[PDB]
Design a protein around this ligand. Structure first.
Ligand SMILES: O=C[C@H](O)[C@@H](O)[C@H](O)CO
Ligand SMILES: O=C[C@H](O)[C@@H](O)[C@H](O)CO
Ligand SMILES: O=C[C@H](O)[C@@H](O)[C@H](O)CO
Ligand SMILES: O=C[C@H](O)[C@@H](O)[C@H](O)CO
Ligand SMILES: [Mg+2]
Ligand SMILES: [Mg+2]
Ligand SMILES: [Mg+2]
Ligand SMILES: [Mg+2]
Lengths: 392, 392, 392, 392
């Protein structure tokens, strides 16, 4: 298969542009020119590109320099037809952000963090971005007594309400997506899982403008089921964006190509997103790859890895489709009663009074006979994997 | 120290009553008589006792027997002065619940599960319990294609809405506390963390009636920071109850005595609950121990372990207070700017307009000079620990 | 695909016979008759069966009963053509073993544990078993001060040395396989990984009679790479047996069907065992499945799951074979220099002096130029997954 | 309590000198001068300093320069009375080492890797170092098909055999300590745990010359019991060196001050190393701190964190001593039968024939009765924790 613009595959400038300087060594690749990155991505089938302010315009560029970069950038976008669906701000690299951006203990840092973001929202709005992703990588602590969490949540909320206000007043029409991460670079990061971020979002002044940007490896860093948390984000209707990559359980963030980590969870994730209710996908935003080409590769490996993300997604999609169109799979689904969960537990108009009145729900319930019937889950799982394996 | 009824130490009947049949071996202790449990707990300092329907009255007891057990149980409470602060229902042991109670694929099981809880609500209301704890230990899956998470959340919501309705109509005045757990016994449990559980509760019909009951070991099974999650729960005002125990990271649930797992986090937790604002505790509910006396122990080890839970809490309490009262700590807190996080980022009346006008927050901000100053967090952490070791 | 006796698939009687009594609930299935298990396994394609003494003869059976049971079992093997490649002893279920068998702090328990094993060695030898597997599930601790590890290792050794003495003297010709596990049921188990078990065995009296029996899920419980661990065991020539199953990282032991956990690792594993040096497998023993049919299944689900194991292994083999046979893979392997690791670093007869005199190895070496060439690893990896997916 | 040269506290140049440039941000501290480091460490009580070649002499310094630095360094040593107990080689930072040093797929890098170490050996020899630590941080892989584990071990062995040859011919008297780590920077590193490294070492040409250098945090990254692995290392007599620091379970390596991660395990570890065999320490080498001052700290924080390491050790030592001297602890130890484990299971001159003849070890053994007695382990654990908290 081949990717179409309708597939909505996007990449961060910082993914294919990662120079591969890790915590233990020097960069192994030279820097990637943004215009060149735009052209190469267009060529492999991406529909959009995203970036942190500091990825495009070097921190501290004078206004003439910044303007020049932006103009050349826009020309590339123009010529290739690529769009900018989301933009983000780097609030983690500069030493000033060592204790966080919006939640640094230092008040002045909190004021500067908000200004850095407002400036990025202007540029995002001018490039046509619809989503602002917020990754508080430095909001957290290494020691419990160093950070008042409650105060931190108050400050977090205080910054986000201002941003929504500015956006709404300027008519930018942006949606905000908080991206959870459990740890790294802080010992413990605030809003550690998709769940924590969703619960926080619900407390903002204008919750409807806020959702989450969950990343495959981030949830896997806590050994949580990514597809299942995505299912819950979809139930809340807070899946505003998604970051796809690979990870091997709890360890530093690996940022492997999507599907190269937990293959079976990648498979069930693609099934969830594309085989939504009513034939159609359950999610329609970008399919964004927030990964890193391995430190062992050169620029050839970089493009190979960019293309592997898309191939992985399309192969899994193909297998998820065949899975569902298989009359044997359908028969197994029926035997396992998956769909029966979709039927209300109470009858139409039944309340507690009528339930209490139904002796078949208790008094005459044969728990023991029901308890002995098998659900056929293993067999269902086996057919799923045989589809993934191309054995069916 | 010594426990008083104002400490509000409570224990589940299933804790000290655990016979020690694990996944790999037979019970090493005989059954504990509930009346005796009441007496023994009263003696060590507990102010209350809790239980699952099935802990007190054997599954499938005739009306006569059930009635008989309750009446003796009420007498023991009477005689001893212990209260029943919370009650819970067993929706995990019987084979009928193998796929869950409220979210079983099987509709007849969901109906039966609701019935079983209504009944315990009645008994709870009758014994004076204020909280209904809901632990969905069988809600989840081993295989992704076997459970429609969205439909399961619908069914979970549907069942809770009804319980609230009933309680309000009967005038029981119960609060409901959902208890999250990431896995075990299901491969993946629905509402895996305190975060996911708060997000969910917010979607119910009468959200003001629902909160969570987080357990130390559950969050640690995912390697999350328990104290930090409780601080978030308190920020949301959803800390309806708490289960205290010990765990050594991502592994099977150990249920050790509180403070026998992650000692540093047990210290910071006690500090957060007790050294609340306005001198007073940030949390006023029961300090409930949901732990298990090790399988290597006899009834003496059982009472020894019960007392250890109390002693650990009180020794930590004593050190958390000394910590906060130390002038050197006060000096370290100041240098760390812990309290500066409580001052709003914006001056009263400032909005984005005024922030944008402040050159000092961006254009004239010296990020480099600010980034060079240390926060003194290591020194502050070292002082906390020396207080914990009784070295200061 | 179809299983042959040459595939050497074996199953423990305790696998398909698991009644599904976990730590949180009662059994969901009835007991399986050993004779019936023998007929069913023979039928699905297994070549052998294994058992714990207590799986076949109920703990405490008189010799009359014991003898009768062995006779019937023996007939079933007879009629079916199944062999007993390995036997093991249950040193974890009975309460007496709450602190271990061989390493219990109680001296009498230690004497008893040895006797229990000698007896099982006798039955093993009578049935033609070649391997005695030792899983020290209760050897370890929940608390650091409770167990002197050094003393424990001395006692583990003392017991094993006696066992080898006896087998050698009785001429049984058995091989001993130590099975490592990090935790569960003890907080921490002695000899937690394949590495620790191999190091320990090297200290026995007759080390050549000892090896390890690593289990997929056991290594994965610590988030280790099972394939890489097996590779090391093979390098040492200590892979005496292997237990195959599935797990999803650090959590309770799941015992899923082989390949239903880390699917990518399941693939590299079959490749390692099967595409050994010169076409031939790198491993020759039994391909033993030590898994459990999920608690949600009935006997139908049980047989299904038994066959899924065989199915998974044969589908994987088939793709591992195709992977290696692919000229494009062959080309990618060359570009990544995988085979160049086989060439000695040193020239023939070259020592320190010749190497120190070689200017090209240091003084005149261009590290920067070599540091920039890519290894093409992502591309090789993508080729492997495409073969797994049946897309190549 | 104050540090003495007898305490043998040592620090790597790279610990206090870490500029806090992490995987997500720029350096927050300026470079530390080596002469300065020697002077500051001498002042806080360190008896020795260690370094990688590249920490002292910048990669690629001409001889004049290198020679100059060493002379200055030696002078500082001289003046302060500090020794160099161990030296190591940086085989991980430079891009040439991206796939490993000794086990890189590239033959030329392997050759260069050996030359770089020989050179460091000469310098170590020159400064009087006794141990060569080898941390194979880049040895491993991100993908299973990229690395032939078997060939890698052959090449790891080939290189070490040569180093020992050279040391021995030259009369250097060095001991070699392999340092295990499960992951980071590589997806999976070869020789991941203490166990894997000990097993490997037993296979070299002069094994007596090889041991391990386990690091607290590295074992904890896999959720292993650090104290328990050290106990096994001591049993094998392979604990040649130790790296002390703190970690919070499986996540990126935190490098916290010793005792700031798992405090209970830090306590059991000091007890193990100090309350050795006679009354004397069980370990006689350097107590080396391989940690990193948190990125949030300035140079005042750096010196505070250095001192914290020594203070945690001395405070734990003091409580470990008190624990063992307590009569109540003695009594708990007696009730738990800790010392009974040190008595041979067999009576002197007893073999399998005598054991088989002992009816009391089996035929007349009352397992039910023994299984009912408790070990009193919780109580023993409780007294240990109370000693730790200075509560007794
Ligand atoms: O772990 C890195 C984060 O995922 C980052 O890439 C965000 O997505 C955007 O700042
Ligand atoms: O992990 C077991 C659960 O904690 C259980 O004890 C509940 O709190 C009550 O159903
Ligand atoms: O985790 C359980 C063990 O794997 C066990 O089944 C052994 O292999 C045999 O005692
Ligand atoms: O994880 C960092 C390593 O521990 C390293 O510092 C070694 O000990 C020396 O190379
Ligand atoms: Mg991301
Ligand atoms: Mg609980
Ligand atoms: Mg096994
Ligand atoms: Mg180290």
């Amino acid at each position: 298969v081949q990717a179409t613009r309708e597939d909505k595959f996007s990449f961060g400038l910082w993914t294919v542009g990662w120079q591969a300087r890790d915590a233990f060594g020097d960069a192994t690749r030279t820097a990637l020119d943004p215009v060149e990155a735009v052209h190469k991505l267009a060529e492999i089938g991406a529909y959009g590109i995203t970036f942190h302010d500091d990825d495009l315009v070097p921190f501290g560029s004078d206004a003439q320099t910044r303007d020049g970069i932006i103009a050349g950038f826009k020309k590339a976008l123009d010529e290739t037809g690529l769009i900018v669906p989301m933009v983000t701000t780097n609030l983690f690299t500069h030493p000033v952000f060592k204790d966080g951006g919006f939640t640094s203990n230092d008040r002045s840092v909190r004021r500067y963090a908000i200004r850095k973001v407002l400036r990025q929202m202007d540029l995002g709005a001018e490039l046509g971005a619809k989503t602002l992703v917020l990754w508080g990588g430095r909001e957290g602590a290494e020691y419990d007594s160093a950070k008042d969490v409650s105060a931190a949540l108050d400050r977090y909320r205080e910054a986000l309400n201002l941003l929504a206000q500015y956006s709404e007043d300027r008519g930018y029409g942006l949606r905000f997506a908080i991206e959870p991460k459990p740890n790294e670079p802080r010992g413990d990061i605030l809003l550690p899982t998709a769940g924590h971020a969703i619960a926080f979002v619900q407390e903002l002044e204008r919750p409807e403008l806020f959702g989450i940007n969950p990343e495959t490896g981030h949830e896997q860093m806590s050994n949580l089921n990514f597809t299942q948390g995505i299912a819950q984000a979809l139930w809340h209707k807070k899946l505003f964006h998604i970051d796809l990559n690979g990870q091997h359980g709890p360890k530093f963030a690996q940022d492997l190509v999507f599907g190269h980590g937990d293959l079976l969870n990648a498979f069930s994730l693609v099934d969830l997103l594309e085989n939504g209710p009513d034939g159609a996908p359950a999610y329609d935003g970008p399919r964004h790859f927030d990964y890193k080409p391995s430190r062992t590769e050169d620029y050839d490996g970089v493009w190979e890895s960019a293309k592997a993300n898309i191939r992985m997604y399309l192969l899994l999609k193909e297998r998820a489709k065949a899975f569902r169109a298989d009359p044997e799979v359908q028969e197994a689904l029926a035997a396992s009663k998956v769909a029966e969960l979709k039927t209300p537990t109470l009858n139409p108009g039944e309340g507690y009074a009528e339930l209490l009145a139904d002796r078949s729900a208790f008094e005459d319930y044969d728990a023991d006979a029901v308890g002995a019937k098998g659900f056929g889950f293993v067999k269902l799982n086996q057919l799923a994997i045989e589809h993934l394996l191309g054995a069916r």
